[model samples]
Target chain A: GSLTEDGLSYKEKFVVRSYEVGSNKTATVETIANLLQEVGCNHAQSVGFSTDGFATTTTMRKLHLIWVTARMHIEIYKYPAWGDVVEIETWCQSEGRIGTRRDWILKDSVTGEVTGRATSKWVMMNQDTRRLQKVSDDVRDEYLVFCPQEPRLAFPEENNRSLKKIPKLEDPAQYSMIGLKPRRADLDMNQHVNNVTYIGWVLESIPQEIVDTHELQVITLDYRRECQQDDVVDSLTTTTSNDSQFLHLLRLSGDGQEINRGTTLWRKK
Target chain B: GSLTEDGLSYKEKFVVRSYEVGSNKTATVETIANLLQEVGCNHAQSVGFSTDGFATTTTMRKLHLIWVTARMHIEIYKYPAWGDVVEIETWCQSEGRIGTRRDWILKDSVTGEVTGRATSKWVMMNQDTRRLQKVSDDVRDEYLVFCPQEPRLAFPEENNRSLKKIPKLEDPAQYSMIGLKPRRADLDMNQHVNNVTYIGWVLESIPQEIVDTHELQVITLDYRRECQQDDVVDSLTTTTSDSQFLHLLRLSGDGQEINRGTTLWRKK
Candidate 1:
């Protein structure tokens, strides 16, 4: 695509490392999330949109703002094994006046098969004030020139019409694991607990039998609040009537305020 | 040395990833360990010494034996920052009748400056019996063809004569932290807790002030035993008179049996 290259899209390839795979010999969901984060960051830098050594745009950095996740969804048809090479493609579009959206497609570099798809919504927040900030015109113009005129949905409405929002797990959760603390290594450059760590806590509360016999097919998460380094967390899970669906909740142990609400669909291995 | 290639030595390059770096923007000790592990594994595979999808000899795989760490030491001169590309070279030599030794040299790819040097000793252990096994002639013959007649040293005796063994931290250590449980994700393909995870636990017991002011220049660890997924751990640390050195101990919380003994610290 060099002859007709545009800053709107980016592509990168990664080799699955020995440590990235799990006991099943397949790359874990957390590894995929990290790869996505890397490609997105590289994409921003490729187009002169980022210069602060991070994924933030130049204008956002000048305003003391950082992008924070609001929602994320991933659909996995197959997981890459160790030593396999996977290529990822990413592009972005403005969500609205306040938020922006990014979408990705994961492909098997060997066979060129679509292995997974992911989408995320991000909103800017003042790093010091910790308050949500609208996308200023200066910030929008700096990056919007690289985005598409309309959002390109990985899960389009025509095909995903029946998809519904993840219902919050209610009280008396069927299972729970409390006292999960963030390790010092878990913090990112921003000094906040990274969103990738949340996925591990989300799955910690599930039954071992399910975890052994089933594989995650779809995962959806709604990030309501960010977590600090010292915050004690509790993960709660409940099985749906279908027996193949699970609802998860991650909340602060202090005030019970929600950190993330999630849903997962599984298939028998 | 493509023109004078030998399977005994191998080199690889890696870029420091965003997640691999710590809050200080430099790659962490664990990241360096992982890179060393990668280069060593690649060296074995390159010489056709490994075929069981792991860093084990074909004969060892057939005998149901795996290599386990005995002792490791790393000396860091500088930490690579995020996005910096570093080149690593690794080679192995026979330690004795039952053990083997591997050494590594890390260099800044762009600047061509040496950044770190590490060496480790490994022994064969039977998977079923959990007993140390002798390196049989057949097992040694498979990999010995690729090794050099004389062992190459990353830290020569003349320059490293002052190095001292890490003493065990006695009772009544100055600081201690308990209830350190291994996360499920910490387990490797062998279903054993990774050696890299032990480094993190070793530093967890150190004082926060020391952690902030001192960058680890030299780290030495003796792996007395392997840890399982269910093992609960306790970390104990003690300071030395130099104010720049500390001793660390990791042990099973229930039995108090030592798992790892370590020492580290140097001024930033």
Candidate 2:
């Protein structure tokens, strides 16, 4: 039977939607990224990729999705070019025991122009032993039918370290270790601190001096464990070797359980 | 056959639950007041009331349930006590005309002590024409069974204006008129800007001087217009004769619609 013109065949996998919070409206970035990652992992031929970094300290949902995807070894990178909209895509090519190569493209949803692009390498692992193995031939052939290669990505030199000296905490007067008690409203439908709420905590934790002096340019976080409601949280910061970078850790106070950790790079204006 | 024990002999209204937004919560006084108003409006009551004093503002929501029918209203009074958790209640009174009289108890939601009370005179109006008409004898008799005296109310006296020179809007430059563009996101499923969003705008519009010098003690707003999506808004504010009071008005950019509001603060 022939498919209808407005049927599933015409639908695209990555669809973006916008949500309004106060005076601002932000598009969904994680939903797009996750779809692309799933496509890449399923394909048999894609390799590592990069993305455009337009960092936002206030938007939490997008940040959490990016962190989770990266920890799964998907290698999500961003440059300053990506603006409000983003895109994600995947492709696969045979690579022996390492299954396939995948790539992603993030673009402005309104403009349809490329904003960020990422490519990742994936391999099927044995379920019991957890070791890399070749993807099944049937799976490899299926991916090749849909995903195609695009222009190679041009990436900047990766510098994960910075030069700033970590500030020392002597007395309460020097630096106040404020405690934030998570409340009922803090918990989302997931029964955990909504990923975005953690971002609020991070921003609130910045030392008053730093906020007054600098504008944050980049933030990258890695998640550890899910934080539950009513968790008393404490944030600690250490300056990096580079004056432009700082490292922050958010921990649950009662159990000393680390919830999430991230590094921020700021350029003083 | 006898009715089962779980079957309805008489239905009872649930006790009003008051949830306080902790002091540590990242909210301004205006936001907290709006939350309380929402509670009243969303409850069983169909209306709310408010009163604006020269310096203080207080508002209440009234909820009433008769048999299986429920209605509510919210009222506002100018100025509220700071650092105090305002208590609120909704109760039923004798039915009149087509509707019934509803009463509200305003107390410290935290302390459970009465601070203020209010009564709303309601008449059942045709849902289509919204015209007030007489209540059916059966309905009136049912409500009469629950008739009670009007709760004692602590109505604050309205401030009187004295004979003095009124300050005129001078350069107006010394004060800032913050302009905000309403976007599609501001609108809720009703296609109107969610009432709560307006409170957010008010908080964001607070001047740095005020934020630095005062702790917001109380706030109240009379919602008059249905602000739709994409309505350009401007918050106009000026200090009142009382240094403790700030007079505010939110107007549409076209300059026809306005929402009158007031805020009270204590010097930190």
Candidate 3:
């Protein structure tokens, strides 16, 4: 009958863009990722992908941490930034018996630098059977055209020394823990989680004891992962030895993954 | 007695800065006039005048408009941008027996281009006696230093033709005029009306019918005067012909002066 027995195909295109406000720069990574997911869903096929690397392109470790924290089990690898540019391209390449392959290119918008690139192979696993299925030939051909025929560079090995050391406790009485349930407003057009909503969550998680007695002085965040809609996130915080201030950390627990980590400083009013 | 009979002093500063956003690019003469008013309240004594405007120097009007609708007794003016820069400045120059003089300058924030400037003199009247008081010598001396000793450029007499046309109406609904009482959240640390809270007033004034039908597309506003912590403000609004949209205006009730304006565009 048809080329594939599964009667399913994987074909999609995805693009991501960035803008600068004054001297500060922010990115819409989740927006682009969600777009790719939407494209895959629309085609009635599951897709796997890898990205080319750029210095500013979100790290796979960070993206993985976010996914795991959000209770997802997809791994991304072999993504490298090409040359010096900041542009990134993504495509669905192979139609295997069980799944599809995807790849990405990262480039600079201003300089057209091919900063980083990556490729990933994904399988369409049946939720009930926990087994793989084949994709159609029509879908395979369509996706192959979008990707490069030649194999690109592979992802670098992880440097264990790069891992951070656990911070030591300074003041036990001063630190506080906060729990928050993701609200409806936290969801963006992508139907997942909005980036800015995380900042709001951090601000809201500050303890009333500290907020009433002290004023927020500074906030620095390293977004490790993207939190999805309806996900509950836990915030753990610790203050410095002196009464001057403290640090904050946020993580998702359902799947035993750390989604994001942040630290905040406060001073007595 | 003390340096002056009033025992109070006043000072003014002049500044000019450039535009950073697109909305400033399409600014109208009315919008420029509103900018001057914003300087007055933003730099007024009650708020954090000492810290704010330190970065972006604002200017005053250079042209004047004779009012035709409200009253000629009230002076109207328009300021137009010459280049990419939008300039603004302010000063308290004269301390007289009955009143004090306030001046402004509008310039391009980039090329240091002068747009327009204006000046107004206000008398301090005792609420209890309704009598004018002489300016304290300390206030006059402090302010005179800020005034330019040499004669400054006079305002060009050119008329601003690009005045915003007041919206026309078809079956426009009249809003119930009500005075707003100040709430705790309305007060800032400086003990004055928070600038953003004024935006809330403009937002609340819109009729629910318009919000229910269309999404808000754009809002352009100017703050003309200040509303003190204890002062009451009157909310006024009118709808345009397209039943889908509306305009909300706010003014100080005590002086019957315009304070803020908002334009709401709805989706078709």
lDDT of 2 by residue, B1-268 (tens): 1112432111111121111122332333333334343333333322222211000012111112112112222333322332244544544455445454434555555566554343333444333343445656654653443334543222324541211122323325224334554433344322445555555455444565665566654444444454554355656556664133333335545564345444556665
Q: List model 2 lDDT by residue over A1-269, tens digit each.
A: 11124221111233222112211122322333334433433232122121111111122222231112112112223321212334444333344444443344554556666555444344444323434445455545534434333433312236422212323322222222345544333442233454444544554556646754654544544556656544567666666632466666677777767776666665554
Candidate numbers sorted by TM-score from highest down: 1, 2, 3
* lDDT tens readout by residue for model 1, A33-67: 88888787777767766523345876677778887
Residue-level lDDT of model 3, residues A1-269, one tens digit each, is 01123323333322221110001111222223333333333332222332211111123233331111111111122112211123343444343544444444444556555543333345433333434445445545545544446543223346421122334333342443334544322343224464445555554445656655754433444455557644566556665532444555667646535565555555564
Give Cα-based local distance difference scores for all models. Answer: 0.77, 0.39, 0.39
Q: Give the Å shift of residue A5 in candidate 3.
A: 59
Q: Each predicted complex: what DockQ?
A: 0.48, 0.02, 0.03
User: Which predicted model would earn the best TM-score?
Assistant: 1
DockQ of 1: 0.48
Q: Which stretches of candidate 2 lie over 4 Å from their true place?
A: A1-269, B1-27, B41-87, B91-174, B182-189, B245-252
Candidates' TM-scores? 0.92, 0.34, 0.33
Per-structure clash totals for the candidates: 0, 67, 57
Docking class of 3: incorrect
- TM-score between candidate 1 and the true structure: 0.92
Off by over 4 Å in 3: A1-263, B1-85, B95-101, B109-138, B148-191, B194-236, B239-268
